[PDB]
Amino acid sequence: QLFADLSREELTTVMSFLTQQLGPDLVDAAQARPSDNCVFSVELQLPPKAAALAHLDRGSPPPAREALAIVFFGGQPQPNVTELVVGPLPQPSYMRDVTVERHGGPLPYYRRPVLLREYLDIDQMIFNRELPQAAGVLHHCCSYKQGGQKLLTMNSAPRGVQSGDRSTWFGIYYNITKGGPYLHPVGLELLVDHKALDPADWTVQKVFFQGRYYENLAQLEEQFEAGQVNVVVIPDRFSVQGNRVASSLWTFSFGLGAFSGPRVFDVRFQGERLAYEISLQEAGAVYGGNTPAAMLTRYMDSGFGMGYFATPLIRGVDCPYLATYMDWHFVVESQTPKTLHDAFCVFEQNKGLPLRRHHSDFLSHYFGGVAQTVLVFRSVSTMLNYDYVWDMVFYPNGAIEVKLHATGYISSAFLFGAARRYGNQVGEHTLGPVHTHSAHYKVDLDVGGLENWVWAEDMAFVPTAIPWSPEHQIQRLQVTRKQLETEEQAAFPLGGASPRYLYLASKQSNKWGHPRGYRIQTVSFAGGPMPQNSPMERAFSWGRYQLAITQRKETEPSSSSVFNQNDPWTPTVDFSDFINNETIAGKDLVAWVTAGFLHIPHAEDIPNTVTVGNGVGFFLRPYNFFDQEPSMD
Amino acid sequence: QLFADLSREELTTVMSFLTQQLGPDLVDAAQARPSDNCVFSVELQLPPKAAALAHLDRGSPPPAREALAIVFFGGQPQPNVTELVVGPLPQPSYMRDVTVERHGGPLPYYRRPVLLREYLDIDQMIFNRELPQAAGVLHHCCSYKQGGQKLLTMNSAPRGVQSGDRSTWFGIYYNITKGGPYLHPVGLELLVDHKALDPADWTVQKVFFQGRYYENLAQLEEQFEAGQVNVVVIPDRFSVQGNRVASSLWTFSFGLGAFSGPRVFDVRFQGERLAYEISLQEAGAVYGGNTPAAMLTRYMDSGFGMGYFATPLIRGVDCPYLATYMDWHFVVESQTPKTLHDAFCVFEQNKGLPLRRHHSDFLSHYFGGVAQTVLVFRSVSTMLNYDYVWDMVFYPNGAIEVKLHATGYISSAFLFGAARRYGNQVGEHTLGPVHTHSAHYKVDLDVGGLENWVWAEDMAFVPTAIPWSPEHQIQRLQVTRKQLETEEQAAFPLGGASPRYLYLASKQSNKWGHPRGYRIQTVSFAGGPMPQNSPMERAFSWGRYQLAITQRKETEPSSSSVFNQNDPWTPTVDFSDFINNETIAGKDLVAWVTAGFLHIPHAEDIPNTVTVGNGVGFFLRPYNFFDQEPSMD
Numbered sequence A, B: 001q002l003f004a005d006l007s008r009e010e011l012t013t014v015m016s017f018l019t020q021q022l023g024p025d026l027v028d029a030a031q032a033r034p035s036d037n038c039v040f041s042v043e044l045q046l047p048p049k050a051a052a053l054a055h056l057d058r059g060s061p062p063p064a065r066e067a068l069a070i071v072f073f074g075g076q077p078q079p080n081v082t083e084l085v086v087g088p089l090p091q092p093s094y095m096r097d098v099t100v101e102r103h104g105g106p107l108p109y110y111r112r113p114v115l116l117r118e119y120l121d122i123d124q125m126i127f128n129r130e131l132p133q134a135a136g137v138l139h140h141c142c143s144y145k146q147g148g149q150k151l152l153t154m155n156s157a158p159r160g161v162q163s164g165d166r167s168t169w170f171g172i173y174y175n176i177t178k179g180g181p182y183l184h185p186v187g188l189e190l191l192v193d194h195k196a197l198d199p200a201d202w203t204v205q206k207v208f209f210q211g212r213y214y215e216n217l218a219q220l221e222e223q224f225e226a227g228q229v230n231v232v233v234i235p236d237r238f239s240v241q242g243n244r245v246a247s248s249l250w251t252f253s254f255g256l257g258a259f260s261g262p263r264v265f266d267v268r269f270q271g272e273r274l275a276y277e278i279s280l281q282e283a284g285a286v287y288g289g290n291t292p293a294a295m296l297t298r299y300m301d302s303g304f305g306m307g308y309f310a311t312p313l314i315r316g317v318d319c320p321y322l323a324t325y326m327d328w329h330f331v332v333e334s335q336t337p338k339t340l341h342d343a344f345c346v347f348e349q350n351k352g353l354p355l356r357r358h359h360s361d362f363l364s365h366y367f368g369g370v371a372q373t374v375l376v377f378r379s380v381s382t383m384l385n386y387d388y389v390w391d392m393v394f395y396p397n398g399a400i401e402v403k404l405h406a407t408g409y410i411s412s413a414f415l416f417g418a419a420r421r422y423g424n425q426v427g428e429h430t431l432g433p434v435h436t437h438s439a440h441y442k443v444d445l446d447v448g449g450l451e452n453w454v455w456a457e458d459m460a461f462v463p464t465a466i467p468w469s470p471e472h473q474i475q476r477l478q479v480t481r482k483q484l485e486t487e488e489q490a491a492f493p494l495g496g497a498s499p500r501y502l503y504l505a506s507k508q509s510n511k512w513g514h515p516r517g518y519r520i521q522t523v524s525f526a527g528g529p530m531p532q533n534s535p536m537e538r539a540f541s542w543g544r545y546q547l548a549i550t551q552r553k554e555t556e557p558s559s560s561s562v563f564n565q566n567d568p569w570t571p572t573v574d575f576s577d578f579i580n581n582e583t584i585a586g587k588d589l590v591a592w593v594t595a596g597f598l599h600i601p602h603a604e605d606i607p608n609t610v611t612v613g614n615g616v617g618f619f620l621r622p623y624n625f626f627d628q629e630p631s632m633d
C-alpha cells in the first residue's frame, strides 16, 4: 500500500524524528506564535511514478515510503517556511530540505497559512482591545454586552493588496446558534494588520461600518458621540481493506490530501489500469460586493485544506446507513495525530434508471434489461460556510463520474448603497453577494499504458451532390478528426469552443482498428474567467481553462499550492506555467479539468442552499477502448 | 379532469360517431390502401387555456371536452388529409373540419405518415417481386433461401428529395433473434417509389449494393452473372388518481400525446401553479454516411409517434418494482382502442446525495441534514432501434428536472470506401454512422400568474479603485441585469452565448423586492445546427435555438408536426415562424428548450448503448419566487 495516507503510527514516528532532529527549538503548533518554530503539518509524500509502477507492475521493491513536513521557521533573522521530506518509514533516518529545489528559492514567511492560535490571538485583540472602544455605537446597533447575542468574527482572504501583506478584513456577525452565524452581519468589518511576529505590534489599519470607512474604532465612536453617525439597529458486492477498494469490476486506492482533498490512485477496470491518479487539486470562490470582505475575497481553499477541513460523514444523511465508512488520520496544527471518524464512505447506489434496454412488437420474444447500480466513493469538506461533497462514482461499463456538490450556508453582507449591483437582498439589512464556485482536478489517465496521444473529434456539414439524384445537394454530416500535437493546442479556454469528442489514446487500436481511448466530458456552468489583468489571477490560472492536457511531470505534482492563498500576487504555483508548447504526441499525459458555476444568492438559499441537480465535474468514458460492451458481474 | 387523455370509452364513442357521420366510404386503417378513406387516429384535443383556467381557478363550467381526428381521404379525385374536432364528449354532436384554419389550406396526401399496411405491402413487393430477381448475388452474400438467416427491412426518412416525393430507401438486414437486427446490414438498399395510390404501380427506382449503385435488381444480378460484381459475404408519500398525481408537495396532471409524447399540465407547488404545461414536442436524429439511408435520414419522430410507439415499462428494470404504474389508451391505425399496459410509472427516488447539510468545530451542537428524495414521472418511447426514456422529476424545494436518456441499439451501415469519414467501424463489414440526437420541449411557465417578463442576469468584471487603498485596483465582480423586450432578444442560438441566469418573472416581487421567478438551466452537449442552407432544415428549425421565449398562442400549440416528416421541404409547422419580434413584456410567455448531443458510435455501443450519465434536458429553478427556503413535508 504505497498510496495509503500515513497512519497514526507513522505520523507519530515522523513527529518524534522531527523533534529529535530539529536543532531549533520547536513549539506545539496548536500554541505557536509568529516568532516560534513549529511543525505545521506532516502527511504522505506521494512516491515517484516510475518507482511506483516498477513496484505495482514489475514487482520491484516498493519506493521508500516518505512524509512531507512543512515547518514554520519563525524564530530567526529571516523566517521562512521549509518543506522536509523525511523517510524511509517505518523508521526514518534522513530529513531532506527540498524547498529550494521545488520553488527556486525560499518560501517567504508571510505565505504561511494563518495558524489557529493566530486566529485566537486576533480574536482576543478584537474582543479585548478593539470593540470596547466602540461600545456606544455597538450598544446602539447590537445590544453589545447588554443582553444581545454574542458576536464572532469571519475570516476573508487574500490579506492585503500586494506580496508581503498580512492584513485581513474580519467581519463581525451575531453568533446565532442557528443555521449560519455569517447570515447575520452587523455591518462592522476590521482590517487587522497581523504581519508582525509579535502580536503586541498588531493593529487595525482601517474600519468599515455600515457603508462608511473610518481610520479606527476610536474615530467611529467619537464621531458617533458627536451625533454624526447614523446607526442601523440589526435585529435577532465490494470490499475495502486498508486503502484499497475492490469490487467485481473495479479496483483503486483512495486517500485524502491534507490540503488537496480527495484522491484516488491506480484505478483499474477488469484488471486494466485506466488512470494512475485522479485527484482534487483546488477549489475556489470569487466574490463581489460593496463591503470590504465581499469585494476582496478570492479563495484558493487548499490554503486552509480540503482534507484538514474534512468533516465526519453523517450516517443516513451523507451516505447510506449501510455504507462502509473509513477513518482518516492527520497531523496539522498539532504535535499528536488526530483521527477524523467517518471521513470516507463507499456504497452502491441504484440510479433508478435502466442501464440497458430495448423492446419490440410481436413474437420477437427477448426484450428487457438490467437496472443501473453504481459504486460511490465520497467525502465532505466543510470550509467555513459551504460544505463541499466530493464524489467519484464508478460505473459497470467502465465509465467514471467525478462531481462536486455545494451545500451549506451563504456568507452575507450588510446591505447599503448600490448593493443590488452585487447580489440580491435576502433578508433585512442583508445582501447575499455574487460569487463563482470553481474546482480543479488532476486526471492522470494512462490509456493502454503510459504513452498517450490526444484526439479531437467532432462533426461537420459539407454539401455534396446526392448520388441517386445529382441535381440535388444534401448537407452531409460527417466526423472530423485531428491528432493534437502540442500542449498549446490542448489548452481549451473556459467558456470557449472545444472538440465535442476529446480523448486520450494509446498507440494500439481496438479490434476494429480505432485508437483505444478514454474521453473526457466536462459538466459545468462556470461563470467566466477572472480577467488576466487582475494582479492575482495567475495564482488560480487553472481557471483560464475548461480542460488542459500537458506532459505528466514529477516536478509538477499540483496545479495550486497551500502557499498561494496568502500570496496570490507572486504565486508559488502558476498552473499556466505547465503549458509551454511541449509535444503531447506519445508521452505520459495528464488532463486537468476545471468545473464550476455562478452563484447569485436568492431567497431560496435561506437558511441553507441545497444540492439540487447532479453537481459539477466530468465524465471519463471509454471510446473504442474495448472491442464491444464490456462484461459485467 | 380536462387534461386527461381520452379513455377507451370516449375513443370508442368518437370512432362510432365518425363511422356514422362519414358513411360507407370508410375502411379500418389497419387494412387501408392508399386509395381508401380511413381514420388514421383519434386522441384528446387540448382545450383553450382561458376556458381551462376559468374552470380550474374560477369554477366556471369545464370546456367542451373534444377529440381530434386525422382522416386520410384517399378515395377521391384530390385526396387530402383532414383534421376534425369531434365533440362534446361523452356524446358528440358535431364534427368540425379545422384543417384549413390551422394550416392555411389543404394538407397534401403525400404528407400522411406511412401506414403499417403500407409497410407490409412494401415488404410483400420487396420479398415476392424484387429480391428474387437477385437470388444469385443474394445466395452468395447471404445464403438467401439456402439456410441463411431471414432478411428484414429497415425504414428511413424523409422520402425523396422534394415536396411530393414518397420514395424511401429501405435497407436489408439479417433478422437476428438477438441484440438488434439493424446491427447486421447486408449492404443492400432499395429506393422504392410508393407514391402511387395503387400499390400495383409501385417500383424500385434505384438500388445500392455494397458500395455501388444500380438501376434495378435485374441489372445487379445480370452484371454479377457477367462476373463484374465482387460480392462480400456477410457472416452470422404520494397518490395517483385518474390523470392527477398528488404528493405532499406537488400536484400535476399527466398524459401522453399520440405523436408528441409525455406531457404534464397544471403543475402546482404547495397549491400554487408554476406551469400550465410542460411537454415533449419533438425528438430527432440527423445521420451521416456514404450509404443511402445513413446519408439521407433526418428524423422528426412525431411523424411516427412518441406516444404511439411508447412501450410497456419493464417492472424492476425501467421503474422500481414498487412504483405505481398507469396504462395509456389510444386509437392509431385501428378502429378499436388499444391499451398500452404500464405506459407510465411514478415513484420516489433517493438520489443518495444529501439535500442540505452543514457541520462545524466544537460546541456549536446543531449540525446535520436530510436525504434527498425526489418524485419521478416516467415513460419510454421505442422508435425502431432507439429507446428514449422521458423523465420529469420534481424536487422538494420547488425545482423540476426534465431529461431524455437514450438507450437501445445503433443502426449500422455496410462498411466500404471512405466509411470512417462518417463514423467508426464497430464490427466486420459494419460501420456505426454519426448522428445527433435532439429533443424539443414546450415549457409554459405561468410565474405568479399569466403575465410574465423575461430577465437576463449574468456577471461582469469592472476594474475599480480599492477604497481603502486608492492606488490599487481590483477586478470588481458584479451582477448585470436586463429585462428582455422582444422575442428576437430571447431566441438564443444553439451553441452560442446566453445569459447564465435566464428566468421568467411575474410583476410582483417576493418579500425582499426581487421579481418572483423561475429560471431555466439547460443541460446539453448538442452538436451544431443543421445549416439553414439545407432545403429541409426549416421543418426542424427549433434546432436553431438552445432556448427561445415567445408569446403563448392558441394558434401555436406545437413546434413540430406529425406531417413534417414526410415533407420537410414545405413544413406544415416551422417553429421559427413563431419568432416574429413581438413584445415579451408582461404577456403569457412560453419557453421552448432544445436539448441533444452528438453520437459517434464506438465499440462500446455493441451490442447495446447504455444510459451512463444524467441525460439531456433542463432544470427549472425558483429564483426569488419564495421568501426563503420552502417548507417540506
Ligand SMILES: *[C@@H]1O[C@H](CO)[C@@H](O[C@@H]2O[C@H](CO)[C@@H](O[C@@H]3O[C@H](CO)[C@@H](O)[C@H](O)[C@H]3NC(C)=O)[C@H](O)[C@H]2NC(C)=O)[C@H](O)[C@H]1NC(C)=O
Pocket: B073, B076, B079, B080, B081, B082, B097, B099, B100, B105, B106
Ligand atoms: C378534403 O377532403 C374532404 C373529404 O372529402 C373534403 O370534405 C368534404 O367535402 C365535400 C364536398 O364539399 C362535402 O360534401 C358536402 O356535404 C354536404 C353535407 O353532408 C352535402 O349535403 C353536400 O351535397 C356535399 N357538397 C356537395 C354538393 O358537393 C363533405 O361534407 C366534406 N366532408 C367532411 C367530413 O368534411 C374537404 O373539402 C377536402 N379539403 C379541402 C380543403 O379541400
Ligand SMILES: *[C@H]1O[C@H](CO)[C@@H](O[C@@H]2O[C@H](CO)[C@@H](O[C@@H]3O[C@H](CO)[C@@H](O)[C@H](O)[C@H]3NC(C)=O)[C@H](O)[C@H]2NC(C)=O)[C@H](O)[C@H]1NC(C)=O
Pocket: A073, A076, A079, A080, A081, A082, A097, A099, A100, A105, A106, A107
Ligand atoms: C530557512 O529555514 C531553515 C531554518 O533555519 C534553514 O536551514 C538551516 O540552515 C542552517 C544553516 O544554513 C543549517 O545549519 C547547519 O547545520 C549543520 C548540522 O547538520 C551544522 O553542522 C552547520 O554548521 C550548519 N550550517 C550550515 C550552513 O550547514 C540547518 O541545518 C538548516 N536546517 C534545515 C532543516 O535544513 C534554511 O536554510 C532556510 N531556508 C532558506 C532557503 O534559506
Ligand SMILES: *[C@@H]1O[C@H](CO)[C@@H](O)[C@H](O)[C@H]1NC(C)=O
Pocket: A362, A363, A364, B150, B152, B153, B175
Ligand atoms: C424477424 O424474425 C422473427 C422470428 O420469426 C419474426 O417474429 C419477425 O416477424 C421477423 N421479421 C420481422 C420484420 O420482425
Ligand SMILES: *[C@@H]1O[C@H](CO)[C@@H](O)[C@H](O)[C@H]1NC(C)=O
Pocket: A486, A488, A581
Ligand atoms: C508551438 O510550436 C509550434 C511548432 O511545433 C508552432 O507552430 C506554434 O506557433 C508554437 N506556439 C507557441 C506557443 O509559440
Ligand SMILES: *[C@H]1O[C@H](CO)[C@@H](O)[C@H](O)[C@H]1NC(C)=O
Pocket: B486, B488, B581
Ligand atoms: C426586431 O428584430 C428584427 C430582426 O430580428 C429587426 O428587423 C427589427 O427592427 C427589431 N425590432 C425591434 C424589436 O426594435
Ligand SMILES: [Ca+2]
Pocket: A487, A550, A551, A577, A578, A579, A580, A581, A582
Ligand atoms: Ca509542459
Ligand SMILES: [Ca+2]
Pocket: A444, A445, A446, A447, A450, A452, A552, A588, A589, A590
Ligand atoms: Ca498519463
Ligand SMILES: [Ca+2]
Pocket: B487, B550, B551, B578, B579, B580, B581, B582
Ligand atoms: Ca410570436
Ligand SMILES: [Ca+2]
Pocket: B444, B445, B446, B447, B450, B452, B552, B588, B589, B590
Ligand atoms: Ca406562460
Ligand SMILES: [Cl-]
Pocket: A397, A399, A620, A621, A622, B612
Ligand atoms: Cl460511457
Ligand SMILES: [Cl-]
Pocket: A534, A535, A536, B474, B475, B476
Ligand atoms: Cl481582482
Ligand SMILES: [Cl-]
Pocket: A612, B397, B399, B621, B622
Ligand atoms: Cl434549485
Ligand SMILES: [Cu+2]
Pocket: A406, A410, A435, A437, A599
Ligand atoms: Cu455559493
Ligand SMILES: [Cu+2]
Pocket: B406, B435, B437, B599
Ligand atoms: Cu445515438
